[PDB]
Amino acid sequence: LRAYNEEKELALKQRLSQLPPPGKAFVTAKEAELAELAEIAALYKTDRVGILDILLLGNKHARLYRDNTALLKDYYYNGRRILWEIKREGAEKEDWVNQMYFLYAPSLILLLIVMVYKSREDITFWAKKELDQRVLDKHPEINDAPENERDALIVERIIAGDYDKLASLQKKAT
Amino acid sequence: IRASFDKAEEPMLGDYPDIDPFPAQLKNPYKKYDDQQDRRNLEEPLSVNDDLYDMWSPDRFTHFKNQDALKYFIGFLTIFFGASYVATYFVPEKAAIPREFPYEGLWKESGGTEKSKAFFGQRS
Amino acid sequence: HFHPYNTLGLATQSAMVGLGAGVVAAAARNSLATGPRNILTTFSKSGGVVTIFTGASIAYVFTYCSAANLRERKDGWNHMWAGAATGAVLGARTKLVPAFIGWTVLCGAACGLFGWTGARFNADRKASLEQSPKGFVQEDAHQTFWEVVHRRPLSLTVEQLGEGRGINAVPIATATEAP
Amino acid sequence: ALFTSLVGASGLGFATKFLSNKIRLKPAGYYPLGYVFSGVAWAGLGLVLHNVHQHSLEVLEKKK
Amino acid sequence: DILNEEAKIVQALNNQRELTIKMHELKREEKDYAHSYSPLFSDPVPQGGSIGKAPGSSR
Amino acid sequence: MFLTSILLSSLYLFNRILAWQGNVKHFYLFASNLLLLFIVVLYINFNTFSNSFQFNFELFNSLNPFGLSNSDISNGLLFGIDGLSLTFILLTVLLIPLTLLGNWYNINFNSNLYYTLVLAIGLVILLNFWALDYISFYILFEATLPLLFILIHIYGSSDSERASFYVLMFTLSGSLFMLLSIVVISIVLNTTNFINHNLFVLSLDLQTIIWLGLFIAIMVKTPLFPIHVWLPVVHSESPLAGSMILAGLILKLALYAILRLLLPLLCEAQILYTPMIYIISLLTIILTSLATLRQIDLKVIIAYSSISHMGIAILGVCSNTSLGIYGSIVLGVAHGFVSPALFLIVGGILYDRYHIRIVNYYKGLTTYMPQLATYIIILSFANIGTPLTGNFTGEFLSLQGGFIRNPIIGGISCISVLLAAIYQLKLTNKLTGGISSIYMHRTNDVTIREKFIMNILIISTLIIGICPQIMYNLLYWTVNNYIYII
Amino acid sequence: EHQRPELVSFDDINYNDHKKVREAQESYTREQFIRLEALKTVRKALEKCYEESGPNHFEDCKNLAEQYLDMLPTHRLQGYLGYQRNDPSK
Ligand SMILES: CCCCCCCCCCC(CCCCCCCCCC)(CO[C@H]1O[C@@H](CO)[C@H](O[C@@H]2O[C@@H](CO)[C@H](O)[C@@H](O)[C@@H]2O)[C@@H](O)[C@@H]1O)CO[C@H]1O[C@@H](CO)[C@H](O[C@@H]2O[C@@H](CO)[C@H](O)[C@@H](O)[C@@H]2O)[C@@H](O)[C@H]1O
Numbered sequence A: 001l002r003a004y005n006e007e008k009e010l011a012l013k014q015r016l017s018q019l020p021p022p023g024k025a026f027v028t029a030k031e032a033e034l035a036e037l038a039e040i041a042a043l044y045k046t047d048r049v050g051i052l053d054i055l056l057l058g059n060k061h062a063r064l065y066r067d068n069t070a071l072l073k074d075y076y077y078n079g080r081r082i083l084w085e086i087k088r089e090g091a092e093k094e095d096w097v098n099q100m101y102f103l104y105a106p107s108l109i110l111l112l113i114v115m116v117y118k119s120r121e122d123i124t125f126w127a128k129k130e131l132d133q134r135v136l137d138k139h140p141e142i143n144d145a146p147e148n149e150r151d152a153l154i155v156e157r158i159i160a161g162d163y164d165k166l167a168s169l170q171k172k173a174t
Numbered sequence B: 001i002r003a004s005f006d007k008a009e010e011p012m013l014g015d016y017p018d019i020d021p022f023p024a025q026l027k028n029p030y031k032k033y034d035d036q037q038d039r040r041n042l043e044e045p046l047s048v049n050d051d052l053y054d055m056w057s058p059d060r061f062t063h064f065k066n067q068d069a070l071k072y073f074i075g076f077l078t079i080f081f082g083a084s085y086v087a088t089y090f091v092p093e094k095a096a097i098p099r100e101f102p103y104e105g106l107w108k109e110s111g112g113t114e115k116s117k118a119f120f121g122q123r124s
Numbered sequence C: 001h002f003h004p005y006n007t008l009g010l011a012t013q014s015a016m017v018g019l020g021a022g023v024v025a026a027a028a029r030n031s032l033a034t035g036p037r038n039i040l041t042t043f044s045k046s047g048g049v050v051t052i053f054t055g056a057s058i059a060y061v062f063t064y065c066s067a068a069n070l071r072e073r074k075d076g077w078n079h080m081w082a083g084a085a086t087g088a089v090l091g092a093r094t095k096l097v098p099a100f101i102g103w104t105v106l107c108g109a110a111c112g113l114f115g116w117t118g119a120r121f122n123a124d125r126k127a128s129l130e131q132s133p134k135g136f137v138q139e140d141a142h143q144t145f146w147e148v149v150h151r152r153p154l155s156l157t158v159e160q161l162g163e164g165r166g167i168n169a170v171p172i173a174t175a176t177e178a179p
Numbered sequence D: 001a002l003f004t005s006l007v008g009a010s011g012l013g014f015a016t017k018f019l020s021n022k023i024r025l026k027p028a029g030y031y032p033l034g035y036v037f038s039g040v041a042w043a044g045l046g047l048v049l050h051n052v053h054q055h056s057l058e059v060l061e062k063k064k
Numbered sequence E: 001d002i003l004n005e006e007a008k009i010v011q012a013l014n015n016q017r018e019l020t021i022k023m024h025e026l027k028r029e030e031k032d033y034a035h036s037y038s039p040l041f042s043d044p045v046p047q048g049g050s051i052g053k054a055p056g057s058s059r
Numbered sequence F: 001m002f003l004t005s006i007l008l009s010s011l012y013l014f015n016r017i018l019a020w021q022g023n024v025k026h027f028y029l030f031a032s033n034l035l036l037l038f039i040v041v042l043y044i045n046f047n048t049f050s051n052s053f054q055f056n057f058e059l060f061n062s063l064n065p066f067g068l069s070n071s072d073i074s075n076g077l078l079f080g081i082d083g084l085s086l087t088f089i090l091l092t093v094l095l096i097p098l099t100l101l102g103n104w105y106n107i108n109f110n111s112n113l114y115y116t117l118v119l120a121i122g123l124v125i126l127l128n129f130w131a132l133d134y135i136s137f138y139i140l141f142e143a144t145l146p147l148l149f150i151l152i153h154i155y156g157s158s159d160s161e162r163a164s165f166y167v168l169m170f171t172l173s174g175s176l177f178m179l180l181s182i183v184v185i186s187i188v189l190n191t192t193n194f195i196n197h198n199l200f201v202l203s204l205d206l207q208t209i210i211w212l213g214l215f216i217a218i219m220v221k222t223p224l225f226p227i228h229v230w231l232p233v234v235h236s237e238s239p240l241a242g243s244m245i246l247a248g249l250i251l252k253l254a255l256y257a258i259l260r261l262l263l264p265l266l267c268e269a270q271i272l273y274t275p276m277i278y279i280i281s282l283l284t285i286i287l288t289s290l291a292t293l294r295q296i297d298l299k300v301i302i303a304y305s306s307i308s309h310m311g312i313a314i315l316g317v318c319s320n321t322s323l324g325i326y327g328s329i330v331l332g333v334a335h336g337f338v339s340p341a342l343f344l345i346v347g348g349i350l351y352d353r354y355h356i357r358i359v360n361y362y363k364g365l366t367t368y369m370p371q372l373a374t375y376i377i378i379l380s381f382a383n384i385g386t387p388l389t390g391n392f393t394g395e396f397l398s399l400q401g402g403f404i405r406n407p408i409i410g411g412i413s414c415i416s417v418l419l420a421a422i423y424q425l426k427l428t429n430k431l432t433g434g435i436s437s438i439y440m441h442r443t444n445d446v447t448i449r450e451k452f453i454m455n456i457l458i459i460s461t462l463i464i465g466i467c468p469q470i471m472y473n474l475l476y477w478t479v480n481n482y483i484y485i486i
Numbered sequence G: 001e002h003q004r005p006e007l008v009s010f011d012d013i014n015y016n017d018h019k020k021v022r023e024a025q026e027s028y029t030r031e032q033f034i035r036l037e038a039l040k041t042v043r044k045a046l047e048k049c050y051e052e053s054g055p056n057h058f059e060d061c062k063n064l065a066e067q068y069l070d071m072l073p074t075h076r077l078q079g080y081l082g083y084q085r086n087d088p089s090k
């Protein structure tokens, strides 16, 4: 539930009405006219919005706000192009970087994480264990072998026996 | 217009100026063009089918004629494989027998079964 | 099976029909026009229509009957060859070769598309859903066109597809059995 | 269900009033009781078509 | 618990398929003279034009 | 009442962001980004052990027209996923914030129109891959075309009239024959359905002549040889978003539709008629990858590159073998990464800077843009099919699957590695090398957003190129669901 | 927990119920992966035979090499639509 001010929001338009257009206010290739603008351009940045203030108001405030922001935007970016204005530090955060680094990128990493650990349940990893269980069901005496010996005593059954039971689903064939 | 494909595009152009296509490489380099890299003045009319006559086009040798060059290449290809084939008739014979192996030709060592002894095994 | 066609008889019938069509079209062209015209300019300022209606009508049915006789069957291909001949007649009015080749290819393809569907502007009464057995089959019946079954016989699919690619007269696993 | 079949036809009504405002070059909410009028009218059309479909289903049920 | 929720949908589509086959067969079914035409006055039989009528005209 | 209340709240929030903020670039980004958070949680609850369709819903049923329905009689519009259907949704949803981002600082005139059209023709191609009837697949197979027509006509570069007419005309002209072949199997079977049609056989004389109506319908959409008239000249005049979403999403749809529609009820009509598919796919690979050499324009080259890779892909599908199906899927998921990155390079970055797309102006890009010439080279060498990039895994398996089915056509078609190297490296060394050009003032380096897009579209190729198995957990049923080798 | 669902043939399961049809599809599929793991196990054994044998691999496991080249045409994925759409002996 952030805040705004109404009378400041009217006085800002009263301030802007006497100002030159954005296509003129910076095309003079200092501080007589360029010093009022370097504060007004920071009125774009100063972040008076309101979280719950957008919900609980009428459109009379909304149109007034929207026209004021649409002029402060030009006074910021035109002065950024020709010339706070007269500084240089990096990097001035943009408009898209909040919901591409903090919603797009972590969901897009979470997608990689889920794809890696969903690959654990695979048909090869299940078919190997099912084939070993099918060996140990018919011939459970190789369970009595030691733990190191069983991995070579299953393979002699696999190589030896068929153990596939595909021709038993095809009883119409023979 | 020199090549047979440049001639075959005369009825398409209607307002195109139809200039003479000349390679960008065979221009001299010592004239100071706008583009020293590609040998081309700033507003110079490009040819019908330019990108065979670009600097980035093929190398386009200029010493031999291409027809002659074809004859010389196939001439070397012929004089190698003809001489090396005729020289197989003038070969001398060997002084040794091929060597021999035990165990009925090592049929069992390189695979094999008693019925299958023909495919595997050498020089009993 | 079939019966061969009288090429000369069908061609001279179509020649008479093309004659009558050329006459009625020249009579239509006189009256649906402007400027000074009389009885004699029926065939003077005719636009050359009676040659169109005559030549197309001869060439189509002559090529059609000839193609149906030398192939000894009737399908949509005969309409393709006959429409190619019709495009040859209609292409010669514009005395240019790539035009002519285009007329012969495209009119022949359009007439072949007409012939393949049944060579009819209307429908066939029988052999369509409202008047043909459709739905599932009831017993081990020969599955006709328009019908569905659940499992085709393997001896039928080996006759239709072949004995090559992956399809075989015995499935591959019971072909490799322990006894 | 009857209720969603009312709410959807009422939403069609809100779309009619909205688009009729936007052809006349008015704002979105111009005469905001007119949304209530169109919602009730098109919802009544949903009532009618819902009941006709009910009775048609019952006529099909009675044929067995 | 998903094979069952498929069997439900496939039954719900085979029911609609049999519904269509029925309602497409119920169109082509021939209809009575009392359903198709005038419900009362169910006969097609005229007795038309009785003022100067002649005995022996019925058949 | 609850899900109605969510909509009545969200439309109000949309209204108030329309009122105070001017653009809805931020709320379209927020919505299209939350689509990821939704679809990944759908991926978590996806049972991979079942061939079955997991998440099913009918819209527009009789008993409930505005919403969901649970009845014993269904005539609405079915929707659901498995596997196959889900890899392409995951391809989609991580790309649509990138095209929505892709024109961020660009539009300047009726931006609210443009981003609405782009987001809408992305949501329609989500629900393409959700669909389950033949009609519900088809009623969104051309809900794209209106908004594509108007997105090309307005906002197209120059001579966008003709391109907009082509994207309506060619797609529609090939699409009506698909409508014919859908009508025929909806009056024979009386079912539009993607679940039951494995059961239904047809007569070979019926199955023969309805495969034509779908094959010369996908011949237009993945542009095969009597088509691809329209592909480069819809690209070359498109805007930036409608080129990425065309070449990354609209093309792979018919790769999905040859799997979903054709292969499992046309089973016996294909094995007679695959060696026409091999003719057409080979002489798109031989012909359209050879007309790339003589191209003056710079976006048209990447257009014909898309044609050549989609011609490799459909001789992996039509192999009736097990490696080719998975190879064509990994082609469709990796070309949809590497190719819109190339459209960001050609009409994305370079047309924003210099506004003319002729090749002849552009040389010496290295001396003033080093960290763009890197993205020229690694992304080109990803398009050719260097290994470890995910394009080679697909090219390799699809050439192998097309080598099983007919080995002479596979041996001839193997030359595509050469033919795809020729034009791409010829373009790369014209752009990368030489003295920085005369015509060209030095402009900005590639900026933070046009790196943020690129590194996503490069890592997402490299992960598939290092492990193509990260999506075998989805696809291993659909490797089997389409083989008819008895 | 390694679950083992049942085997359902396509023969006599009445292709009007989608329960037994889909289980028959998945069962023929899963048994086909099992049929493949025998190929993938003999290949793993043949390579160990080769690497330990060294020069006499020609005669130590001629049987395993010929074994692997016998299984290779007939242990792969083949499709349930071949056996579902067609019946032998009809
Ligand atoms: C999607 C774009 C693709 C365009 C395809 C359009 C062309 C489709 C044509 C094929 C089709 C319509 C089927 C269309 C259904 C879907 C149409 C889909 C969209 C339509 C746009 C028209 O078939 C026509 O084919 C022509 C040439 O092939 C013939 O030409 C002519 O030949 C000469 C006289 O024969 C004339 O003297 C000559 O003047 C013409 O030359 C015609 O005779 C024939 O009627 C086939 O219909 C027919 O097929 C036959 C089996 O063959 C069926 O009978 C069967 O008999 C037993 C045999 O096993 C079995 O008991 C059983 O199997 C079945 O009982 C029929 O029931 C019937 O149905």
Ligand SMILES: CCCCCCCCCCCCCCCCCC(=O)OC[C@H](COP(=O)(O)OCCN)OC(=O)CCCCCCCCCCCCCCCCC
Pocket: B056, B057, B058, B059, F286, F412, F415, F422, F426
């Ligand atoms: C029988 C045994 C077989 C064994 C081989 C037999 C000999 C085969 C020899 C030919 C094969 C060589 C590989 C083909 C690619 C050639 C590429 C090439 O050479 O590009 C070089 C060219 C610039 O090089 P250059 O200007 O000369 O450099 C001078 C530096 N001072 O750069 C360029 O700008 C060239 C751009 C065009 C590249 C060539 C395009 C045509 C390629 C022909 C391939 C044929 C495919 C036909 C497919 C039909 C299939 C049915």
Ligand SMILES: CCCCCCCCCCCCCCCCCC(=O)OC[C@H](COP(=O)(O)OCCN)OC(=O)CCCCCCCCCCCCCCCCC
Pocket: F003, F055, F056, F057, F059, F068, F123, F126, F127, F130, F139, F140, F143
């Ligand atoms: C142009 C004509 C085409 C048809 C009109 C266009 C479609 C209109 C939008 C309707 C379709 C999507 C929205 C509603 C269906 C999904 C949400 C839902 O409520 O159902 C939950 C869904 C399936 O339902 P179920 O799993 O059975 O659980 C319900 C138990 N009662 O459980 C799930 O698995 C969720 C699946 C959601 C994914 C849907 C596809 C994502 C794309 C959404 C696009 C929506 C476009 C809306 C545009 C808004 C503009 C104001």
